[PDB]
Design a protein around this ligand. Structure first.
Ligand SMILES: [Mg+2]
Lengths: 735, 485, 729
RNA sequence: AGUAGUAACAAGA
RNA sequence: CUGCUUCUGCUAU
RNA sequence: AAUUAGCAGAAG
């Protein structure tokens, strides 16, 4: 009775060689179902739990219960600690400024030179921004545009000066306004007859109105984060909460992250902003340098570590001091600009999500209790854990459904400045002139420490001193996820070094599917992914040919484009079998037209129409590569349209986002008005899609001057008659 | 100031390093040995090793799945013409009469002259799919006044012990069968010598992987999830009979069509990505549930007759179960063929390493052996307490079954167990390399693992396998104490 | 169609919302309002693609007369949607409509595909006209380097290339005329000729032009072929354990052929210099060396240039030596001189310390740059004379700049007042002199200041120019604008007819670089021109394969198996001064393990390839002692004597050897009573093991404490982490 | 019922 | 109600 | 020796 043990593969193979079997990335990642009030409230409580021994007070700007853990008492146990001592932070920056002389002033000069050229369109490079005019999440360009068109009502016209600096001046000149006026969106909840259990339907038709808010409510909205839960997070058992900052915050976070990026690029002992094979070569060079730096006869230990509560124990009052000590020679305006962002991060107000849902089981009823109405019911109508969390939230719960969140770094937009703090903890290298020396690597919250000493008890003293030093800056090294072996095998950001970094195939395994843009682009993407994993991820030739076969099978079963000689039935396979029987040279059919695969290893970078261009029938090539094929939307002036060069398998799938019971009339019409204005502007100026058009004047004036000059040049070169020229100038005079 | 602020810090803030020895490593997950916990029930989507495929030797026509199920049931006319239930097992909150009437409705719907596999909304269909079980949503003021509308506690996953069927699923899905099931398309012709080496490696790797039971189960899952997503998007307000099917080729090149049972898709207005569609599955089998009674507390098992696969006569049971799935598990079921790749690369790399020691392509020397190379044998499993070495293709099939079961029983517990046990695998490797690893808080490191072992059968069996392999490593380490002393 | 645009503008300004959108949005905020989207983009594209294909009509039609060719029903299949849903929605169709277009659609002209996708058609042509070689199975040491992915013709920086593309396609709204318009007006007018009457969308033409012009450099793992003709097929080229020879198509450049020729000559001399009669082995390897299509002698014949190594291989084969060297744009020919490079800690003008190569002696050169000539004369870290001819002023400027930097004078180092990058972003070692050369091109005015000035010469044809590049009064110190056969040795030295050498085997540089093209050694044992880890792994595989014969001939013979052809290849990666010391130590340890009957097989395998060179003992007939044996290149490359190493490890329980990662199994070729034997008898030379850890003799003695002992004195030795032993001489 | 898993879906974002 | 940064890949909707 | 965005995947 032989019983199979799959761990016994590890008897003949080391773990780092067979590490790709320890990554279950063929399974389903964990998603979040329902609300995100529980993890947000637990985040607020656990953030104030590691900081409650500091100075608690009440802000006189908003009215929140602020908490100041910095310069507080020292920790007494191995609990997480947020009380970062200021003198230790400034001394670590003294060591890091001694060791790299001239680094801080060079980084500050480069960041100030980058800031004086940056325009406001840099604030359209975000995924989903918390919009304060609707208290929701809009996209970044939509949130920026609503903010600009709302600041124009309050006589803040500094966004028409082009740059970023007058826009941030407008931001901090909005905080000293007695009343703000903006554009809000309300709706009509129309009642309609239906046929279901409840009987009727509630159709929400949204339309845009004008709103007016007071000063302190604006200060609370502009400092607010929007909280949600993160999905598809592999490697964890329980979920967590994340936050999203507004448009009045990212405009200042950009400069501080650019400053810290300029510092991080020039530190030898970091892991940012490198990435890819660049990071592998840098880490291998660093490990070899720290391996040849060992004393004759000593012992070099390596701590594979991780920090617990990175966003929950760092403080913006330390980042304010770091931007005050880094920018110690810049002009005073730049020091104010670089000190605004950790000030706004020390007064952040977390919004508490969607609320909790209460159900009556015997009546088959349920309802949603929101965040303002959270304490409106007794706490006996909750669970155990929700009752405990709502009891702990009550000092900080504000009466509008938000909560004060002074300590911590919940939104986590300082991935480079905290790396600077971790390297400043790594750049100390000794305490008390004892017989060791440490040196490490630090990405944003993952480190790897190397301690060279005479024997391993001295190495343990060095590790204990590094832990005590990290406690002084707000860095709690996790004693459960860290371990320490000798040098040669460690792990850093899921890169497993065993005398050279090993090849992990299973991490980049979820990219191998059909990416889903259209047929042609998915064929190109899939073959390029197989080729790049063959280059730098250890996928051999046989595995790559099998991946070609599996990609072709998944591609055919997705796009319903099986081979024309097969017997599979469908709405597409009818005409596919007809095209197979019609075509003479069937080896030139694309796989989307029911054709044979001719991809192999040596031709993975050549596209599908190029590889099959000398095997095509001329009729099929003329029908495929038609310049006026109605599946690719050309650039026409809204015939005289331009020729769309690529095939018919470059079609577009309009993701018609229509919510249930939501008549999106007006939100379609405003987006269509913006699209019409931009389409006429691109008709007048052709390079608007290649190069960003600069200019501090109106679009109507630019279009009017371009059309006036265009008519004048079309008249004198004969292309325009005198009556057409008179019509043109008579139209332009009435504009 | 750092040395100043390190002298007024208490000595109770330390890292407490501890030298890791072999006897310091305790078995992970002790509660799975406790006999006062129930055995972990079978909670997969479809049957994997207890499957029964009704064969039908078709004549080269991928005509329709409804016509395929009709012809395959016309071949087995006695199992189709059963109208009397013989109840063998029943689930707790089940209904044997409604499930038998729904199976007869599926049989009468799949074998008609019509062209549609839709069901009507009868009483048994509305019970088994589940209609009107959503809670009514009322306004917040009426619920604020209502002192009865509490907020319900979440159901924590139950704690379970090691059920002895997971070892049976590992042992049977890692064996060779006589049929293929992979639908691998053709590839371009080979010109470079890399492509000749790759094809002559692929023949060995595929001939080991393709003729095994886990490949048939994998293709069953892939095809059923593909047809289920197709019927879910095309038919949202309709109950649809979807046959569970597969295409098989034996060693002779003859192609059979294997029917594995039928399924009833519920109402599938899946607006979100985590919305559930109820699938009522009726699967054939030949395994008596009275043998292992704790394996199936989720199934309703009837008996519908006998089957002569040879001169021997076997029985046929019908496992009925209400089940459910969402869009994301259907998408990751349509992409399950990647379980080849993660299992192929991990073996092929080993071949390549051997190819850089001897100087020639060592695929044949690894799989089957040649004149100047004994074949590669891997320590593959236990047999009455001792250790057995198996073949190369055996280990390839074991890694393939492991990746397939990573898909099949995959949820948040398997991810958390995988991460927090990988952190301990690297410690055991640092103990085997004689690097002398040091830990700082081992009990919390063990406690991060042991909160992921709730009811996942793969996680509980993997903790059992971890404890077995760790006992073997502790037994093996007792030779190093005689080195230079 | 200007009048149509004016009429569209008049139709748009009568709508009161677009009027206030146009009148208030600045042109800088067009970039903001262009991306205005009210609904979020959907999260999963693959799930929406697998879910949207199972619907009636997932696609979207473009309204026109070409969309009306598709019928509303084709044999029962509704291809496109019904026209009753036209009103403020749009028209949709199924994927079967795409397949009907590909089968029964109207025919069109495929001219515009071949123009736009010309880069991919050239990419296909370079693979169709390409021959393959043979695949080899063995270790490949890959180095991560920034390489160019795709071949080009005119590699331009992306801002200059964007300005050029704006001057080709959109010349009206092009901006300020920069310097890029001047040095590329040929390409601008030629591409504007070739793209004259075309009707493609201009943004597709912009991206095909930037695919033709702009470079793309990425950090890829390369091994032996870094040119963009070999990087485009890098996946099929080599792996971690195999290498496929490839001969690409198209055409190559002489700069890559010269670079790979220099690399191949350096590798041939470096492997040759450890042999007996190195000239014979050097010619024997240099005959059968093919730089991707052709032998090494043809490359040495046709290429003007090279280094010391190219000249030694040229004179070894019987060719005329070309003593011409390069410093980027500065081409030089050595008239007479003899200088040797040593590393110097140079402080530079902004206060940074760098190890820079500094030469000695006194040298004279015929220098040249562009179409300007000159004669330069220098010494150790000092410019002395530079007599140049009359040519263009900026070429003369570059010539004097390159002669100033090439002289390695103290003023050139002291004038670097700025930000110099002596390192990569990934911490790799850039060349100091080429970095100073690239710095001192445009910001050389500080070099003009810190160099100084003096009077002119007052001879007949000697007039000195100034920074205005005219014949002024005050010229720079040392610059005058005037208007006017070897043998080869056994040790690979180039001696003249009289005897004064010009080049030697000590003068080849040790920059172990990666070749541009692919070098092939058509020889048995072509692995001896590999890198360090390849030679270590191949030598240890050769010791493992022949372990029984080596073990028997060591247990019988005395000095007839320390000499093999494999250890001759192994010696060329041990540094020169420590090779005899490592040899004496390892020979004494192996003779110790033979003479007294304690034998270890892992130590025999480990320290056998170090027993090749003749033993350099101490001054009293006793060997040295070592902790580790450091090999050439990198920090990982060492062999630990007592511990394990990155290049060597041994598991005694499983009996498994690890060489550079790869695991061989010693189970079967071993003495079965060896695990009862102690490691400390095979750790030092003359020191054996007698007892246990004794604190009555002191702490663990170091190397200098053990080398100054006497026969009989006992010490404590720590083998690895946990095992202290006693030790007697 | 069921999927599941610290909170939801089991039709009306 | 799917945040920030880095790297890679594809495309110019 | 040196060389303008959108979306997806991974890591943190
Ligand atoms: Mg880590």
């Amino acid at each position: 009775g032989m019983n199979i043990n799959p761990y016994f593969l590890f008897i003949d193979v080391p773990i780092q060689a067979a590490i790709s079997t320890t990554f279950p990335y063929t399974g389903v990642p964990p998603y979040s179902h329902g609300t995100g009030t529980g993890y947000t409230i637990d985040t607020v409580i656990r953030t104030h739990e590691y900081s409650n021994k500091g100075k608690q007070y009440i802000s006189d700007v908003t009215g929140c219960t602020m908490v100041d853990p910095t310069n507080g008492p020292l920790p007494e146990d191995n609990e997480p600690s947020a009380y970062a001592q200021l003198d230790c932070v400034l001394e670590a920056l003294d060591r890091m400024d001694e060791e790299h002389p001239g680094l801080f002033q060079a980084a500050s000069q480069n960041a100030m030179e980058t800031l004086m050229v940056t325009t406001v369109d840099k604030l359209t490079q975000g995924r989903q921004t918390f919009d304060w005019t609707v208290c929701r999440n809009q996209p970044a360009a939509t949130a920026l545009n609503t903010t600009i068109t709302s600041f124009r009502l309050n006589d803040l016209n500094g966004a028409d000066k082009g740059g970023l600096i007058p826009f941030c001046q407008d931001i901090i000149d909005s905080l000293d306004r007695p009343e703000m006026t903006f554009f809000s969106v309300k709706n009509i909840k129309k009642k309609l007859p239906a046929k279901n259990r409840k009987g009727f339907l509630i159709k929400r038709i949204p339309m845009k109105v004008k709103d007016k808010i007071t000063k302190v409510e604006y200060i609370k909205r502009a400092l607010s984060l929007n909280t949600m839960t993160k999905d598809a997070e592999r490697g964890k058992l329980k979920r967590r909460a994340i936050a999203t900052a507004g448009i009045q915050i990212r405009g200042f976070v950009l400069v501080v992250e650019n400053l810290a990026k300029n510092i991080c690029e020039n530190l030898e002992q970091s892991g940012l902003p490198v990435g890819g094979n660049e990071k592998k070569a840098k880490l291998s060079n660093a490990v070899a340098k720290m391996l040849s730096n060992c004393p004759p006869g000593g012992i070099s230990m390596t701590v594979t570590g991780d920090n617990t509560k990175w966003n929950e124990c760092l403080n913006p009052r330390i980042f304010l001091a770091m931007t005050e000590r880094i920018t110690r020679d810049s002009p005073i305006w730049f020091r104010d600009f670089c000190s605004i962002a950790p000030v706004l991060f020390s007064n952040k107000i977390a919004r508490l999500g969607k609320g909790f849902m209460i159900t009556s089981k015997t009546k088959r009823l349920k309802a949603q209790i929101p965040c303002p109405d959270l304490f409106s019911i007794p706490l006996e109508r909750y669970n155990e854990e929700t009752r405990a969390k709502l009891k702990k939230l009550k000092p900080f719960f504000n009466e509008e459904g938000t909560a004060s969140l002074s300590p911590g770094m919940m939104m986590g937009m300082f991935n480079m400045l905290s790396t600077v703090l971790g390297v400043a903890a790594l750049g100390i290298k000794n305490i008390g002139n004892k017989e060791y020396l440490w040196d490490g690597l630090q990405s944003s919250d993952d480190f790897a420490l190397f301690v060279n000493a005479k024997d391993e008890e001295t190495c343990m003293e060095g590790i204990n001193d590094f832990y005590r030093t990290c406690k002084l800056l707000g860095i709690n090294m996790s004693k459960k996820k860290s371990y320490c072996n000798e040098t040669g095998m460690f792990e850093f950001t899921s890169m497993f070094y065993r005398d050279g970094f090993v090849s992990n195939f299973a991490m980049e395994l979820p990219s191998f599917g059909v990416a889903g843009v259209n047929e042609s682009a998915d064929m190109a993407i899939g073959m390029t992914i197989i080729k790049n994993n063959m280059i730098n991820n250890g996928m051999g030739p046989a595995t790559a040919q099998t991946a070609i076969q599996l990609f072709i099978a998944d591609y055919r079963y997705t796009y319903k484009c099986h081979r024309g000689d097969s017997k599979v039935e469908g709405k597409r396979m009818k005409i596919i079998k007809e095209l197979w029987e019609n075509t003479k040279g069937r080896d030139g059919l694309l796989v989307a037209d029911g054709g044979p695969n001719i991809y192999n290893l040596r031709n993975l970078h050549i596209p599908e129409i190029v590889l099959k261009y000398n095997l095509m029938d001329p009729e099929y090539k003329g029908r495929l590569l038609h310049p006026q094929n109605p599946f690719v939307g050309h650039l026409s002036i809204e015939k005289m349209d331009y020729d769309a060069v690529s095939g018919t398998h470059s079609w577009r799938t309009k993701r018609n986002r229509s919510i249930l019971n939501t008549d999106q009339r007006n939100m379609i019409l405003e987006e269509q008005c913006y699209a019409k204005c931009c389409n006429l502007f691109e008709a007048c100026f052709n390079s608007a899609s290649y190069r960003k058009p600069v200019g501090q004047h109106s679009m109507l004036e630019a279009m009017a001057h371009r059309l006036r000059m265009d008519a004048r040049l079309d008249y004198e070169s004969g292309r325009m008659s005198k009556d057409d020229f008179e019509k043109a100038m008579a139209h332009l005079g009435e504009i | 100031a750092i040395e100043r602020n390190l002298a007024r810090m208490s000595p109770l803030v330390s890292v407490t390093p501890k030298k890791l020895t072999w006897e310091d490593l305790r078995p992970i997950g002790p509660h799975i040995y406790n006999h006062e916990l129930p055995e972990v029930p079978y909670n997969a989507f479809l049957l994997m090793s207890d499957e029964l495929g009704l064969a039908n030797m078709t004549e080269g026509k991928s005509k329709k799945p409804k016509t395929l199920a009709k012809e395959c049931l016309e071949k087995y006319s006695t199992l189709r013409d059963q109208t009397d239930p013989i109840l063998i097992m029943k689930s707790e909150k089940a209904n044997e009469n409604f499930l038998w009437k729904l199976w007869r409705d599926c049989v009468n719907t799949i074998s008609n002259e019509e062209m549609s596999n839709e069901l009507q909304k009868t009483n048994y269909a509305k019970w088994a799919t589940g209609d009107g079980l959503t809670y009514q949503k009322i306004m917040k003021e009426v619920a604020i006044d209502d002192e009865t509308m509490c907020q319900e506690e979440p159901k924590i996953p139950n704690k379970c012990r090691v059920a002895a069927w997971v070892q049976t699923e590992m042992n049977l899905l890692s064996t060779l069968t006589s049929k293929r099931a992979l639908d691998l398309p053709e590839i371009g012709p080979d010109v470079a010598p890399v492509e000749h080496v790759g094809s002559e490696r692929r023949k060995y790797f595929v001939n080991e992987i393709n003729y095994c039971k886990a490949s048939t189960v994998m293709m069953k899952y892939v095809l059923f999830h593909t047809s289920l997503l197709n019927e879910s998007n095309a038919s949202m307000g309709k109950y649809k009979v979807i046959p569970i099917t597969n295409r098989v080729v034996n060693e002779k090149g003859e192609s059979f069509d294997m029917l594995y049972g039928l399924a009833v898709k519920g109402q599938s207005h899946l607006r979100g990505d985590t919305d559930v569609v109820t699938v009522v599955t009726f699967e054939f089998s030949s395994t008596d549930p009275r043998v292992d009674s704790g394996k199936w507390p989720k199934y309703t098992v009837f008996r519908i007759g006998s089957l002569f696969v040879s001169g021997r006569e076997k029985s046929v049971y019908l496992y009925c179960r209400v089940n459910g799935t969402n869009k994301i598990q259907m998408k990751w079921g349509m992409e399950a063929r990647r379980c080849l790749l993660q299992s192929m690369q991990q073996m092929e790399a080993i071949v390549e390493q051997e190819s850089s020691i001897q100087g020639y392509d060592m695929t044949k020397a690894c799989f089957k052996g040649d004149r100047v190379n004994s074949p590669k044998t891997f320590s593959i499993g236990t047999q009455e307490g001792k250790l057995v070495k198996g073949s190369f293709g055996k280990a390839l099939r074991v890694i393939f079954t492991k990746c397939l079961m990573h898909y099949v029983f995959g949820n948040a517990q398997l991810e958390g167990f995988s991460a927090e046990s990988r952190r301990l695998l690297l410690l055991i490797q640092a103990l085997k390399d004689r690097k002398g690893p040091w830990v700082f808080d081992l009990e919390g490191m063990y406690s991060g693992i042991e909160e992921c072992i709730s009811n996942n059968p793969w996680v509980i069996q993997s903790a059992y396998w971890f404890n077995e392999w760790l006992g073997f490593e502790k037994e093996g380490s007792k030779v190093l104490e005689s080195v230079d002393e | 169609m200007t009048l149509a645009k004016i009429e569209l503008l008049k139709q748009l300004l009568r709508d009161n919302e677009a009027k206030t959108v146009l009148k208030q949005t600045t042109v800088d905020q067009y970039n903001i309002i262009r991306k205005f989207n009210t609904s979020r983009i959907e999260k999963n594209p693959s799930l929406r693609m697998k879910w949207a294909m199972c619907s009636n009509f997932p696609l979207a039609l473009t309204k026109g007369d070409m969309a009306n060719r598709i019928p509303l029903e084709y044999k029962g299949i509704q291809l496109k949607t019904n026209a009753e849903d036209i009103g403020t929605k749009g028209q949709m169709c199924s994927i079967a409509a795409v397949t009907w277009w590909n089968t029964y659609g109207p025919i069109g002209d495929t001219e515009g595909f071949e123009r736009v996708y010309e880069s991919f058609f050239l990419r296909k042509m370079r693979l169709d006209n390409a021959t393959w070689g043979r695949i080899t199975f063995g270790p490949v040491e890959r180095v991560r380097k920034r390489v160019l992915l795709n071949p080009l013709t005119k590699e331009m920086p992306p801002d200059e290339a964007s300005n050029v593309i704006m001057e080709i396609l959109f010349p009206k709204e092009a901006g300020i005329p920069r310097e890029s318009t001047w040095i590329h007006r040929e390409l601008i007018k030629e591409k504007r000729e070739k793209l004259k009457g075309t009707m493609i969308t201009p943004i597709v033409l912009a991206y095909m032009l930037e695919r033709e012009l702009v470079a793309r450099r990425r950090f890829l793992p390369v091994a032996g072929a870094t040119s963009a003709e070999f990087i485009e097929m890098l996946h099929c080229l080599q792996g971690e354990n195999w290498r496929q020879i490839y001969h690409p198509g198209g055409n190559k450049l002489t700069e890559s052929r010269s670079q790979s020729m220099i690399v191949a000559c350096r590798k041939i001399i470096r492997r040759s210099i450890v042999a007996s009669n190195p000239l014979e082995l050097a010619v024997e390897i240099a005959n059968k060396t093919v730089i991707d299509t052709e032998p090494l002698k043809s490359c040495l014949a046709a290429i003007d240039g090279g280094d010391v190594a190219c000249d030694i291989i040229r004179a070894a084969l019987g060719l005329k030596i070309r003593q011409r060297q390069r410093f980027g744009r500065l081409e030089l020919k050595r008239i007479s001189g003899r200088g040797f490079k040593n590393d110097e800690e140079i402080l530079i003008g902004n206060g940074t310390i760098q190890k820079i190569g500094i030469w000695d002696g006194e040298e004279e050169f015929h220098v040249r740059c562009g179409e300007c000539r000159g004669i330069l004369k220098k010494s150790k870290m000092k410019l002395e004379k530079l007599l140049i001819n009359s040519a263009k002023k900026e070429d003369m400027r570059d010539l004097i700049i390159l002669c100033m930097v090439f002289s390695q004078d103290t003023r050139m180092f002291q004038g670097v007042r700025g930000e110099i990058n002596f390192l990569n972003r990934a911490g790799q070692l850039l060349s100091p002199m080429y970095q100073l050369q690239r710095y001192f091109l445009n910001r050389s005015n500080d070099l003009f200041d810190q160099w100084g000035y003096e009077e002119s010469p007052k001879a007949s044809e000697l007039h000195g120019i100034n920074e205005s590049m005219n014949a002024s009064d005050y010229t720079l110190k040392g610059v005058v604008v005037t208007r006017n056969k070897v043998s080869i040795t056994k040790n690979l030295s180039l001696i003249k007819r009289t005897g004064e050498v010009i080049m030697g085997a000590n003068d080849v540089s040790e920059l172990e670089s990666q070749a541009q093209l692919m070098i092939t050694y058509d020889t048995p044992k072509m692995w001896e021109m590999g890198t360090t880890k390849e030679l270590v792994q191949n030598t240890y595989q050769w010791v493992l394969k022949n372990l029984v014969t080596l073990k028997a001939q060591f247990l019988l013979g005395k000095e007839d198996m320390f000499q093999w052809d494999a250890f001759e290849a192994f010696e060329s990666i041990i540094p020169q001064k420590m090779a005899g010391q490592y040899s004496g130590f390892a020979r004494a340890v192996l003779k110790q393990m033979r003479d007294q009957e304690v034998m270890k097989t892992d130590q025999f395998i480990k320290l056998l390839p170090f027993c090749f060179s003749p033993p350099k003992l101490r001054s009293n007939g006793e060997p040295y002692q070592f902790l580790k044996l450091v090999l050439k290149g990198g920090g990982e490359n060492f062999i630990e004597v007592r511990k394990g190493s990155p290049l060597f490890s041994y598991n005694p329980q499983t009996e498994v050897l690890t060489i550079c990662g790869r695991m061989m199994s010693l189970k079967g070729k071993i003495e079965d009573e060896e695990r009862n034997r102690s490691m400390g008898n095979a750790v030092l030379a003359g020191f054996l093991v007698s007892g246990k850890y004794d604190p009555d003799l002191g702490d663990f003695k170091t190397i200098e404490e053990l080398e100054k002992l006497k026969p009989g004195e006992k010490a404590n030795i720590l083998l690895y982490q946990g095992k202290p032993v006693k030790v007697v001489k």
